[PDB]
């Protein structure tokens, strides 16, 4: 019966050639969970609102207000790239591979464990005693309908633990509802307090409201018990591991070089730009380097910090990441920056409710804004640009000095080109279920996977109610025994990639990790310290070089 | 389910006689084990560096620098050949067989044991309660690919238990890290404290930093569960098990006897020496029993501690061991002096800190070394050496009185042969793993055996952490609840051997057992006292003479 | 698993009649036994001198010197004939079976339980709590092999529990060890103090020393395991169940009677013994019942109270019982006297440290002896017997009036016939392992059944160690769980065995149970007590006469 273990620990990664260049990645990963008792004891419909901040007139993007609802369900969803493979292998794919896709996924529970504690006074104190309770039970559900709201375990940025050696807790589960919002819009301190703020009431016609007993097949699971999964496969397709350089400024035939340069010093010339071939959508009779026509439109202005309002209140409009270039607009080209805990990365010496944060700057080079060179120019065309005959980013657009054009210009069109996110090692989204829409977008920017099935299916999972001896729902007694349960994790996320082959001469830029110093590939990062702290900081993602024409 | 044994207990040792003159030596060895809740929660990188010692002018051998990786994980390393066969068997094997070789080798681990401590106050007291936990499990990983450091067990005498019926505990797990110590030479009272002497920090390109929980599938068993290994063969050879008496000196034709002694007193006599047969390397016109050329060398000159020093920091040069002769050179030929403990073999009356040592001397009367007697003389071979013409044990090279010739010579050369190092019974090291370079040394000092296929993979195992009703690793607080462990091992090292013949006329040494005596063979070294104390002295090797020609 | 029973319990006695006066005794036996973690945690060797006695001139059989080897071990020997079949049926046995004889005999071992015990403050007390501890297991180990010393539970008179109703404890292991023990004779008051009188050393050819670790194949079991031996078979030869009237006087044809009785009160006569056809062995012409030849010779005289010393100390020179005679000679005769305990036969109410003996006396009265009888006659063989040629039980033969011819005779000669040693119902040894000699005794004195194969194997038993939490063999800190165990005993004791006829005219002795009185056959003697006391006395062996020619 009980007393015998259910299964096994693994957490490797290996590597399967099947030649031609393709190569399946399966990534085993095993942890040990920790579940306490939930607080509350039923479906709670908190409403939260802070008014330390909407309050004021010149805080507006701090607006917390919303309505979720708390369930008495935790949750395990391990949906982080460092919860899976290893720092070391990361650095191997990403050097080699050239893409890499989700295949397969599957989940199991052994050697399920429930306790008890109670209270003993040892020399006047109170020391807890630990008692194991066989009869305790958990229970688990996998929702592989996905009829309950998508959690993201990344959105919040409380995944399992990125430590094999060390124990994890499962965060609680928890969805939004129905609740109409307003806030009016105030700049430092406009004439009088803010108009509108307030929260609403459940409406009708968007009143979401479910329960994970009514929702999957609860599955009962003792000491002695166990429990495993079905093999998912994903259809998400392949992401590229590699960036681009080419901007729109190269991609034809160059313009034919007249003069040869007789000294490594100087450089060649072109030919008379009045009098040269080529193609220019300007109705001038000359063509340079600017004016070239060119296949398509390599990345696109994006609105700076377009804050779009709606029933559900404000909002940072999301922007897809792009390269920052000389220009240093790190905000201005969405450039995503994050912030994680102990348990998710952070060095454990670093004691303090400080969690640590990093700014993400993508690779796509070739997609890169800069808004301190953005400009137009009148409808006719001149060599000589007019004092009124173009928009700079310096001129008042709006009766506002630093309200530009770029600041709320959308230069997607049907010839915008661009790649896709490159996904972090530590704290990064794998993948994610898609908006039920009729035109959902073309991309997600929380993760590069997009399930274009049916989604992998969130598992939940809550300990089983250990009623005391005396009970009474009608005069709210609800006695409970403090109980709390540790479950082990085994996961393989089996996946294939494919890897590029040296067709350059001149060596690409690989991702090594220097001497203990100031370089930040330093080995120490990643290497346990005397306490035996510990810190998973990012790593480079798609180092080697991707011609894009 | 849980609630009864698993496996069985037998720690004798069998006797095939395969016929032919080889027998087949079978020895099983079962134990109690003991393992503690390991103090480290996850892996430290401690860095040792004594200056109690280091920074002395004196002292330099005393450097224990070094910086290690202590693991949460312990181990079940039963390297030892008194944890083995029993002390009465050996002097049979000894005496009989006249060569030995390790086959195969199994390991079971059965009635798995966890229990809980609580305290209990008893009249003011607080006595101590133990409760057996069967919800609570261990953890067993056996690393047969090695991909962990290999850690012998002899090298820093902790293996098992030698002791039958007498517990033994599993010694932690560690291994060393890359670090670039430094330390200058000093010697007395140089003019100035020690010039450099520093410890290191962590490089990128020798970072080695492995973890147990990614290296091996850990097997969950609790109470009722029992694990087992397959059946590992060795592919070693096989160690001879005589001593040779057989010098440079004795080896083809001995010199034409001239004259027959009269009487059992006086000798007889050569030819003359001038006008003799025989080959000599010297242009000389004579030949004697110092000169005459001989098939090969029979040992050589070793340099007398040899510190070099290294990135990792100054060692002593290993050397092979060989027979002390009547210099009576011990630390000159390289004796390897023991320090065990009580759980290892010394008397568990001699209460105190201080471990039992002895100096082990080789058997190899052929390649022993004698500098009270080594010398060379100049090119021009003369009778009468000269006062300039010859280099004695007792000329000052290197502006020192202390220093000459033989600390600082190597006689290895094309025609070195010696013996292997007579394996002792208690402490004693079996097998070994084989350095990972292209050309590997041609045997090892710490174990006769050298495992030439891969190696049999050390035993890892760790308790099951039991976790308590409050846990939050974000904030430093790892409640874990008392406990500990204590499973049995069983282990089958199969291997045959060969015996040799009387061949001889004159009665070969053996090994007996002298009444109790100041005789060192006394029984009562292994016999049980009024108490119950016993104690494990070192049993004499190759007993048997060998020709070596 | 465990939680369920693993035999079952059956101590009855069923008769097969297999016919042609042959019948097949099956003897089941079921006992509880309560075995305790042994103190010694390993083998001691204690060396036993008693000197409040060897020290005194007068005290010369009180020479308790010795060295034995104290084991971890106990031992579950039930050889005793009332350990195995019970007190009415013996009666039935002798009273009709004429001879019996070993055959086959089994064991088990079910419902092993351990516990362990804690202290617990009751009101300022301190009662002890007892909780089982289901991974707990004990150990057992069949030597059926015999390599370890044969000790037998009569002898030292600690085997099981004569009592089916209760429990039993296991007498612990041990065996004598080799010591060169001396000790001078003094008589009464001798000038001046014992000569020698010391211990000895280890002896290197005569060391033995055994472990039950590695001598026999340990079987783990707990409380959900049970063991069981194999059908051993015994070899020995029946012995007979009837005693032996017929002396060397009466043999042959009787005298001729010459004279026949008138009266029931006269008697007849013979014929002259001068002249009267016979057989003598003397020169003499005349015959009679005192010079007859006989056949061979009943019985004869033997040296009463021969201490006879040796390496190991002086000792009594074992002697082969008989019957007394009229010379009511015990000590003379080799009638052995026993000393049981309560939980061996004695009465439960007579409370003290005095056990209970009684003086066997054989049945033998064919072989009896008479010391005041006794007497040697000149070589010329003369009626009147002279007053130096003859040789009288008052002779003073050793310048002693107490040591005569017949405290130093031996007659044991070609010619000597006698009986076997009647086994004893209570604390009677069953049987005995053979001596390892050239030569062995034609008999034993300890055990009429003599194993001429090899030995049934003693069966072994050890508590498994419990250890604490806290341990290290180097610290001579061996902390050990107090912790018990009690496990059921099931054996069946097969023999066949057959019943005489009758073939007289006039009933044959019996053995009745007389009411309650002064007769020793008294029913109260084996009848419980109002408190429910009860004893075990001997019973009457051999009751039916044998002819013994």
């Known amino acids: 019966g009980v007393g015998v273990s259910t299964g096994s620990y693994d957490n490797q990664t290996h590597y399967r050639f099947l030649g031609d260049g393709w190569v399946e990645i399966t990534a085993l990963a095993t942890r040990l969970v920790h579940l306490n008792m939930p607080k509350s004891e039923n479906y709670c419909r908190i409403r939260v609102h802070n008014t330390t901040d909407t309050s004021v007139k010149g805080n507006m993007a701090k607006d917390d207000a919303h309505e979720q609802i708390w369930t008495p369900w935790s949750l395990v969803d391990a949906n982080a790239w460092g919860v899976w493979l290893q720092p070391s292998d990361w650095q191997y794919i990403c050097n080699t591979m050239s893409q890499l896709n989700l295949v397969s996924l599957d989940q199991e529970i052994f050697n399920v464990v429930l306790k008890t504690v109670t209270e003993q006074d040892l020399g006047g104190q109170a020391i807890k005693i630990y008692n194991a309770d066989l009869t305790a039970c958990m229970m688990v559900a996998v929702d592989s309908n996905n009829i309950l709201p998508y959690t993201p375990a990344a959105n919040s940025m409380e995944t399992l633990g990125f430590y094999p050696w060390k124990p994890t807790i499962a965060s609680p589960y928890r969805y939004y509802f129905c609740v109409d919002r307003d806030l009016s819009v105030t700049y430092e301190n406009q004439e009088g307090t803010v108009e509108h703020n307030v929260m609403g009431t459940p409406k009708g016609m968007n009143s979401q409201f479910f329960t994970i007993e009514n929702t999957q097949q609860i599955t009962l699971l003792r000491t002695g018990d166990e429990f495993a999964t079905g093999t998912y496969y994903f259809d998400t397709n392949p992401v590229k591991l590699t960036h681009t350089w080419q901007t729109n400024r190269q991609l034809g035939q160059p313009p034919l070089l007249s003069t040869f340069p007789e000294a490594d010093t100087d450089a060649g010339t072109l030919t008379a730009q009045g009098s040269r071939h080529g193609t220019t959508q300007?109705?001038?009779?000359?063509?340079?380097?600017?004016?070239?026509?060119?296949?398509?439109?390599?990345?696109?202005?994006?609105?700076?910090?377009?804050?779009?309002?709606?029933?559900?209140?404000?909002?940072?409009?999301?922007?897809?990441?792009?390269?920052?270039?000389?220009?240093?607009?790190?905000?201005?080209?969405?450039?995503?920056?994050?912030?994680?805990?102990?348990?998710?990365?952070?060095?454990?010496?670093?004691?303090?409710?400080?969690?640590?944060?990093?700014?993400?700057?993508?690779?796509?080079?070739?997609?890169?804004?800069?808004?301190?060179?953005?400009?137009?120019?009148?409808?006719?065309?001149?060599?000589?640009?007019?004092?009124?005959?173009?928009?700079?980013?310096?001129?008042?657009?709006?009766?506002?000095?630093?309200?530009?054009?770029?600041?709320?210009?959308?230069?997607?069109?049907?010839?915008?080109?661009?790649?896709?996110?490159?996904?972090?090692?530590?704290?990064?989204?794998?993948?994610?279920?898609?908006?039920?829409?009729?035109?959902?977008?073309?991309?997600?920017?929380?993760?590069?996977?997009?399930?274009?099935?049916?989604?992998?299916?969130?598992?939940?999972?809550?300990?089983?109610?250990?009623?005391t001896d005396q009970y009474d729902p009608n005069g709210a007694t609800l006695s409970r025994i403090v109980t709390y349960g540790t479950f082990f994790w085994k996961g393989k996320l089996t996946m294939r990639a494919k890897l590029r082959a040296n067709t350059t001469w001149n060596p690409v830029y690989q991702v090594s990790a220097e001497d203990n110093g100031n370089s930040y590939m330093s080995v120490t990062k990643w290497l346990p310290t005397a306490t035996g702290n510990m810190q998973s900081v990012p790593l480079i993602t798609r180092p080697v070089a991707r011609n894009t024409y």
Chains 1, 2, 3 share one sequence.
């Open 282 to 467: 300007m109705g001038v009779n000359w063509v340079s380097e600017a004016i070239r026509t060119r296949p398509a439109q390599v990345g696109f202005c994006q609105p700076h910090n377009d804050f779009e309002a709606s029933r559900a209140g404000p909002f940072a409009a999301p922007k897809v990441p792009a390269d920052i270039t000389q220009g240093v607009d790190k905000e201005a080209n969405g450039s995503v920056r994050y912030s994680y805990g102990k348990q998710h990365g952070e060095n454990w010496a670093s004691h303090g409710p400080a969690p640590e944060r990093y700014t993400w700057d993508e690779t796509s080079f070739g997609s890169g804004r800069d808004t301190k060179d953005g400009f137009i120019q009148s409808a006719p065309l001149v060599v000589p640009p007019p004092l009124n005959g173009i928009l700079t980013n310096a001129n008042p657009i709006g009766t506002k000095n630093d309200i530009h054009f770029s600041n709320v210009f959308n230069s997607y069109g049907p010839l915008t080109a661009f790649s896709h996110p490159s996904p972090v090692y530590p704290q990064g989204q794998i993948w994610d279920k898609e908006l039920d829409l009729e035109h959902k977008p073309r991309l997600h920017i929380t993760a590069p996977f997009v399930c274009k099935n049916n989604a992998p299916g969130q598992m939940l999972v809550r300990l089983g109610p250990n009623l």
